[PDB]
Amino acid sequence: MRLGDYKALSFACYGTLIDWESGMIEGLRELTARVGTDMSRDEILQAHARHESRQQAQTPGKPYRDLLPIVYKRLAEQWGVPFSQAECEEYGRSVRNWPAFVDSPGALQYLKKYYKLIILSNVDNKTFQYSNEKLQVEFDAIYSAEDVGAYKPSDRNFEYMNGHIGDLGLEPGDILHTAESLFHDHVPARKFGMANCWIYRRHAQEGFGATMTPSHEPTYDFRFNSMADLVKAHQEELRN
Numbered sequence: 001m002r003l004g005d006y007k008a009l010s011f012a013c014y015g016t017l018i019d020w021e022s023g024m025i026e027g028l029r030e031l032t033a034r035v036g037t038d039m040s041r042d043e044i045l046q047a048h049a050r051h052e053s054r055q056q057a058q059t060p061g062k063p064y065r066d067l068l069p070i071v072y073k074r075l076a077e078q079w080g081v082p083f084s085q086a087e088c089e090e091y092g093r094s095v096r097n098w099p100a101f102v103d104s105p106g107a108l109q110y111l112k113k114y115y116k117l118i119i120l121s122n123v124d125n126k127t128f129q130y131s132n133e134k135l136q137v138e139f140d141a142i143y144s145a146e147d148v149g150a151y152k153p154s155d156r157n158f159e160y161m162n163g164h165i166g167d168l169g170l171e172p173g174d175i176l177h178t179a180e181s182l183f184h185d186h187v188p189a190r191k192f193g194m195a196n197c198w199i200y201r202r203h204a205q206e207g208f209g210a211t212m213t214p215s216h217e218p219t220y221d222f223r224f225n226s227m228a229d230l231v232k233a234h235q236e237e238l239r240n
């Protein structure tokens with residue numbers, strides 16, 4: 001069972017290629033400073049994961065940049081600190097500052113040589129253009145939550161990808177779904193019978209950070225601690 005068996009990789013973006021945990025810690029810094037209970041990073045991320053995934057279910061058609069402001073409000077109210085709508089809206093704009101993992105641009109450019117690259121992302125298209133600039137690769141397709149009308153882990157996102165990859169000359173069995181989030185990506189990927197590759201960005205950390213804690217952890221065909229390690233295993237495959 002080999003990385004080279006696939007014509008395409010489908011990538012989650014935020015948490016896999018973009019360091020959204022660092023990004024949102026920064027975007028929430030003013031808000032969490034108001035709380036002054038000195039919350040740990042992961043408590044902030046997990047609190048965000050809860051309000052984000054629930055609001056994504058509540059208003060699946062809402063652009064991510066308009067959804068995160070509601071998450072900010074919910075966090076502020078849960079934590080019991082004051083806030084303004086203007087801060088909420090600004091937090092939804094902060095995605096465009098969320099930094100790439102440093103191995104992402106180089107890894108994606110390497111992978112581009114060997115695979116069509118597909119994005120399957122919990123994001124709106126306007127926001128994602130900024131992330132794509134940070135990533136410095138051309139994607140063969142970008143299937144976003146805005147396109148879909150729903151957020152991962154909804155079935156609709158994978159259905160929407162499967163219904164469009166024919167335009168790229170692909171079938172679902174050609175695609176290795178590559179992602180960090182067990183909850184958003186690997187549970188549904190397995191439900192759709194996709195081969196999957198877990199980029200275990202949190203290998204040296206505890207718990208699931210900005211993704212919901214899955215009750216039934218999914219299997220995965222490949223696992224690597226980083227995009228760099230995915231590339232390393234690929235180069236090794238070609239050596240053999």
Ligand code: NA
Nearest residue numbers: 013014121122
């Ligand atoms: Na994403």
